[PDB]
Structures are given as structure tokens and as C-alpha cells.
């Protein structure tokens, strides 16, 4: 009755049968299946001289666990800019893959590697792609580590093809997001002098390629500074890249079939009901989805295939009688057994008006009396009604009665029998027509 006074939001609600807002669902269950994953390999990054920006090193991590904190505490972050994800979510999540672009980069230039920038870094050195959830980081490497410093910072200031008979036409060649420049091959390990307009400018098979290396001998700072372009992917693989954790023992689903449980199965995170079904789909893919990319299946390590039904809320209705201040509750389309087992119900239903099975579902607060009515004001569906009790204010479960029509017997004689009135009255029908 409070769910009614608050689902239609007033003290004064008239008699009727109302749908109300249900109660929350529990997430206590955990069905977790995690492989014994190897550690991700942050060794090529953590040792040696980092490359320049146009010769960035790419790392792709799949099917491993990361001790990210051990890596985050090595570097000294200065600026980050995340798009579609956050660093905390990166530190706490599971992914199909993790892609890292890392290189040496000076902090004074971190605006040239900003979305929409107009300089030479986004034209010839590195353009960040935004197809996946990605994030930029600029950080300083402490000296005591195994990471060494380059001679300086270098970049590509001019990449161009000279075309025409006299090579008098100068046309720029620009990079696509996430790719390398054709001009990378002139000075792979960095330019040795500022302004290194190369002397021969290798003649390619469609014209003459021109590079300039005004990407200077730009003095190395006292501490090495680096750029990191992080990107993550979801749902593209059967395995996941997950943080290092200890999660106890929740690996079994054998005797938890039918209960709403949360789950973390090779990275995929959610909640739902697991039910042993017949194996469909491809077992090699380990997941069965629907047309909307919702998980509706799972091939377990035990050897069984389970349908993943989202754990649902039991519908509930309130029959309200205002004159006698009496009410009852209908659990629409639910057998009373499932009600007696389940929960997600209000405080007064910790609990002879007990669970009664009707044609519209289990009801609480109705006394079955096998009575009939003709005109009733609280219909419940399927010719069932709820009658306010005139004496016990408990509502009773009645039925709408079909009164039979009176039969007049035709005669076996020559003519027929007709009923002709002997009195009458004047009825009055009232009708409203809106104009």
C-alpha cells in the first residue's frame, strides 16, 4: 500500500487494481572462471633506449595478467587525456586486447599531439586514432631505472613528393591515424642534425621523396620524457587481459543453477541466471550472443553449456479498496511455489489469505470463498474479481457470473407461443456526447 501511495504518489488514491514498482535484485552470487594466465611482458619497454615519435614501438597484449600498479609507480605522469575510458577503469578492467604505442617525447611539445592540432607531429610523425577507447599519457622516467636516454629528441618536419618533369611541384605526404610515415626510413634512429635536408632524397618508383629533419638535435632534458598512447578493445576475443587479483573460490555453478548471480568469466562481467541447456553455437568461441550483442550462452570449463537468462523481477499488483481500507497483492503470472522460495519483496512479506493460486497468478490477502458476483468494481482478469467484505475486512476472491437466458419452449401445436407484456415502465438511458 505504501508502494502504491509512492508509485502513484499521493495519499488519496481511489479503489482499483494497480501495478507498482518491484523490489531490487541481489548480486551476492559470483560464478568466476579465470585461466591461469601468464604475466604480460613489460620488458621491451622497461629496458633500453625508447625510440623517437615517428618510429614508435607498438605493444599488443592478449591472454595475460598485468601488475599495472608496479608499472604506474615506475613512471612520473604529467598529463593524461582519456576518451571513452578513464585511467581508474583501465586499472580495474578486463579487455580483449591492450595496445600500447610508446616513444620518447619532450613535455614542451605535448600540445602538438592534441586532437585537432596543426603542426608537423600530426602530419608526419604520429596521429592518434579514436576508433577504440584510447588514452594519452605523458610521463617522465626516473634515472635509476633500466631505461636509458637517447642522444636528443627528433621528429619529421617535412615529408613530400616532388613530381613533374622538372620536379617543380611540391606535394606533402601525410600519415593516417596510427600509422608510420614513409619518411621514417631516412633516419630510423633519429636525425643527427637539426635541419637535415637529406642530400639524395631517395628516388622512389612514382617520383622523388623529400625529407627534412628540422626535428632537431633538440637537447635531451635532464630526465627522459616519454609519450604513451593506450587503447583497449572489448568483446573481440575469447580470452581477456585482466588485473592481478586473488578472488577466493567461486568456480562452481553446479548447485547454483537458477539463482541470479554476478559473473566474471574470462573477462566478461555481468549478472544473470545460468541454466543447463543443450549446446548450441560454436563451442570454440566460448560465448553465444544475440543480434544485439547480449550474452545468452556460455561453454563452461566443466564441459556444460549454460543459457544465460538475465535475472528478472517478479511483477506485482495491488488491489485496493478505499472505503474499507483493505488491499491485496497479486504476483502476476507466478506460481505460488516460486513465490514461497524467492525474495526481492518488501518488508511486510516476510510471511488463511496465504499464497493462493489463481488464473492470474499467486495472490496474497484474498480469501477463497467460491462466491459469485454480477456487477463488481475490482476485476482481476479471467472473470475473477475482488469483493470488499461488508462484515473481517479481508477482500474475497469472487467470480463474475454468467446468468443464463430464460428458455421459452416452442409448442407442438399449429401456431406458436409468444410472451406479451401485462405491465410496463418507462426506462431512461442517459448518454453524454462530447462535441
Amino acid at each position: 500500500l505504501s508502494q502504491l501511495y509512492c508509485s502513484y504518489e499521493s495519499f488519496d488514491v481511489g479503489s482499483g487494481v494497480y501495478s507498482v514498482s518491484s523490489f531490487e535484485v541481489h548480486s551476492r552470487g559470483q560464478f568466476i572462471e579465470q585461466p591461469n594466465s601468464v604475466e604480460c611482458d613489460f620488458t621491451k619497454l622497461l629496458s633500453g633506449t625508447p625510440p623517437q615519435v615517428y618510429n614508435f614501438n607498438r605493444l599488443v597484449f592478449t591472454n595475460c595478467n598485468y601488475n599495472l600498479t608496479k608499472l604506474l609507480s615506475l613512471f612520473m605522469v604529467n598529463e593524461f587525456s582519456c576518451d571513452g575510458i578513464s585511467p581508474d577503469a583501465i586499472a580495474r578492467g578486463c579487455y580483449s586486447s591492450l595496445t600500447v604505442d610508446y616513444f620518447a617525447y619532450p613535455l614542451s611539445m605535448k600540445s602538438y599531439m592534441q586532437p585537432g592540432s596543426a603542426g608537423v607531429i600530426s602530419q608526419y610523425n604520429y596521429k592518434q586514432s579514436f576508433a577504440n577507447p584510447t588514452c594519452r599519457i605523458f610521463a617522465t622516467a626516473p634515472a635509476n631505472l633500466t631505461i636509458t636516454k637517447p642522444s636528443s629528441y627528433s621528429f619529421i618536419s617535412k615529408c613530400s613528393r616532388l613530381t613533374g618533369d622538372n620536379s617543380h611541384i611540391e606535394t606533402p605526404i601525410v600519415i593516417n591515424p596510427g600509422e608510420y610515415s614513409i619518411c621514417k626510413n631516412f633516419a630510423p634512429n633519429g636525425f643527427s642534425q637539426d635541419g637535415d635536408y637529406f642530400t639524395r632524397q631517395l628516388s622512389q618508383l612514382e617520383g622523388g621523396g623529400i625529407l627534412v629533419g628540422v626535428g632537431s638535435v633538440t637537447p635531451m632534458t635532464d630526465t627522459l620524457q616519454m609519450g604513451f598512447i593506450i587503447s583497449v578493445q572489448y568483446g573481440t576475443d575469447t580470452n581477456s587481459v585482466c588485473p592481478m587479483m586473488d578472488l577466493g573460490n567461486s568456480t562452481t555453478i553446479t548447485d547454483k543453477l537458477g539463482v541470479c548471480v554476478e559473473y566474471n568469466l574470462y573477462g566478461v562481467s555481468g549478472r544473470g541466471v545460468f541454466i543447463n541447456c543443450t549446446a548450441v553455437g560454436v563451442k570454440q568461441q566460448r560465448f553465444v550472443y544475440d543480434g544485439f550483442d547480449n550474452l545468452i550462452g556460455y561453454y563452461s570449463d566443466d564441459g556444460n553449456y549454460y543459457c544465460v537468462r538475465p535475472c528478472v523481477s517478479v511483477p506485482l499488483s495491488v488491489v485496493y479498496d478505499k472505503t474499507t481500507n483493505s488491499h491485496a497483492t497479486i504476483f502476476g503470472s507466478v506460481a505460488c511455489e516460486h513465490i514461497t522460495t524467492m525474495l526481492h519483496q518488501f518488508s511486510r512479506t516476510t510471511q488463511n489469505s496465504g499464497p493462493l493460486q489463481t488464473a492470474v497468478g499467486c495472490v496474497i490477502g484474498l480469501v477463497n470463498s467460491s462466491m459469485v458476483v454480477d456487477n463488481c468494481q475490482l476485476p482481476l482478469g479471467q472473470s475473477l474479481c475482488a469483493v470488499p467484505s461488508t462484515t473481517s475486512s479481508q477482500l474475497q476472491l469472487a467470480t463474475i457470473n454468467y446468468t443464463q437466458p430464460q428458455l421459452l419452449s416452442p409448442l407442438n401445436s399449429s401456431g406458436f407461443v409468444v410472451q406479451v407484456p401485462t405491465n410496463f415502465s418507462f426506462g431512461i438511458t442517459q448518454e453524454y456526447i462530447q462535441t
Binding site: 580483449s96 568483446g235 573481440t236 576475443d237 575469447t238 548450441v280 553455437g281 560454436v282 568461441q285 560465448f287 553465444v288 550472443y289 544475440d290 543480434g291 550483442d293 550462452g297
Partner: protein, 80 residues
């Protein structure tokens, strides 16, 4: 290529579907495309082909048949 036989379709990675139809974008061949045919010889190593989006190879279509090299026997698949 016959789309009614699902010729050269790359299966979705990390997931599967059962008993449903749906549209899906990606990288697919063109229906009715004939492609280039190579026989295992001569002249193949001299020709450079663009890779633009990749390609799909059909291997062993003539196996368990009667034929001979083109430069009599039972045919077999030869893994390009």
C-alpha cells in the same frame, strides 16, 4: 564467389550466434567475383599485387579429380 553459400566469410571473433540472421559489416568478397587463378611453374614471383584490405584463398577445389599441369593423374591441394 557465391554469397548464397557464404563463400569466403570470416567468422566473428570472440563470439558466436545460433539460429538467427543479422546484417554485419566488415571485410567480405564481392558476390560473383572470379578472382585471379594460380596453378602450381612460372611467372608468379615476378608479379606484385596490392594487398589493400587482404584477400581470401580457396584451396583444393579440384582435388579428387582428373587433370594435369598446364606447362593423366589425380589432383591434389598445394597450399600457396
Amino acid at each position: 564467389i557465391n554469397a548464397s553459400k557464404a563463400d569466403g566469410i570470416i567468422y566473428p571473433t570472440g563470439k558466436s550466434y545460433s539460429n538467427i540472421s543479422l546484417t554485419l559489416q566488415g571485410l567480405f568478397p564481392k558476390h560473383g567475383d572470379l578472382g585471379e587463378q594460380y596453378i602450381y611453374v612460372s611467372d608468379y614471383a615476378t608479379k606484385v599485387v596490392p594487398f589493400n584490405n587482404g584477400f581470401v584463398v580457396r584451396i583444393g577445389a579440384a582435388a579428387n579429380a582428373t587433370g594435369s599441369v598446364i606447362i593423366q593423374k589425380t589432383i591434389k591441394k598445394i597450399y600457396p
